[PDB]
Amino acid sequence: HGELNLNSVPIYNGELDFSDKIKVIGTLEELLENSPCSALEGISKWHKIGGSVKDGVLCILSQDFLFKALHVLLMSAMAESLDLQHLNVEDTHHAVGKDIEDEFNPYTREIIETVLNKFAVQEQENNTWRLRIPFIAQWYGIQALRKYVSGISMPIDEFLIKWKSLFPPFFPCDIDIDMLRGYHFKPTDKTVQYIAKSTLPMDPKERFKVLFRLQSQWDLEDIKPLIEELNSRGMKIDSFIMKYARRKRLGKKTVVTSR
């Protein structure tokens, strides 16, 4: 089957008393034993979907709670001047809990560890993590697209500001709309709009037709992640595009338009 069996794995959205509002899995070892995948596949996928444990219950963080956890992690790590290139769970967990004392702190050690396993890579020195900064930047940008430019467009300079304002002050990343290839289109060359690739036509002629209505000229790198799902012959993407559209290679940039 190749995937984890999430049948009994509940979604955690920051609730106060998770174990009572929830036939539970308590351990990742248990989940792997009951899953039709290898241990390495199961562990890797656990990290990508944001699997965690809360109140002894194996769970999966909701996308809203994962966003909030990453955001407070980044604010707190900058506020304590942690080394974003050498983070350990202990300092990071302490940094986020420092100013959460009078109420409910859902950001336990395991939640912190889930965020780091999703947005960071562990170094083969200590039990230490290095943030994947461009990946975090892209993930923020995707949230900004969905919130601000779902069904309407926005000038590029205004969008970049709203995108940048999600980061902690002094966060060491330069952002660039090219990070969001596969998640947006440019209705004009100075505006941007969100697009969800999952909702595009499964017929390639119809998909290219729809994409040229959104944007009459595409850089090949911009349209590629929106069409590659249909390239089942595995050919070079330029040859695939040439079957359904016109290409013109400029200097090094290829521009693609309808035929």
Residue numbers in the entry: 114 to 135, 142 to 243, 246 to 380
What does the paper say about this structure?
While working on this complex, we also obtained crystals of the C‐terminal domain of Dcc1 (residues 90–380) that diffracted to 2 Å. Phase information for this crystal form was determined using multiple‐wavelength anomalous diffraction (MAD) of selenomethionine‐substituted protein. The refined structure was then used as a search model to determine the structure of the Ctf18C‐Dcc1‐Ctf8 heterotrimer by molecular replacement (MR). To identify whether any common domains were present in the heterotrimer, we performed a three‐dimensional homology search using the Dali server 48. The results indicated that Dcc1 contains three‐winged helix (WH) domains from residues 182–252, 253–317 and 318–380, which we have called WH1, WH2 and WH3, respectively. A large conserved basic patch was present on the surface of WH3. This suggested the domain could interact with DNA as basic residues are able to bind to the negatively charged backbone of DNA. A gel shift was observed with both ssDNA and dsDNA, suggesting Dcc1 could interact with both substrates. Mutation of K364, R367 or R380 reduced the affinity for both ssDNA and dsDNA, albeit weakly with K364, while the triple mutant K364A, R367A, R380A totally eliminated binding similar to the WH3 deletion. These residues are widely conserved and suggest that the binding site for ssDNA and dsDNA overlaps to some extent.
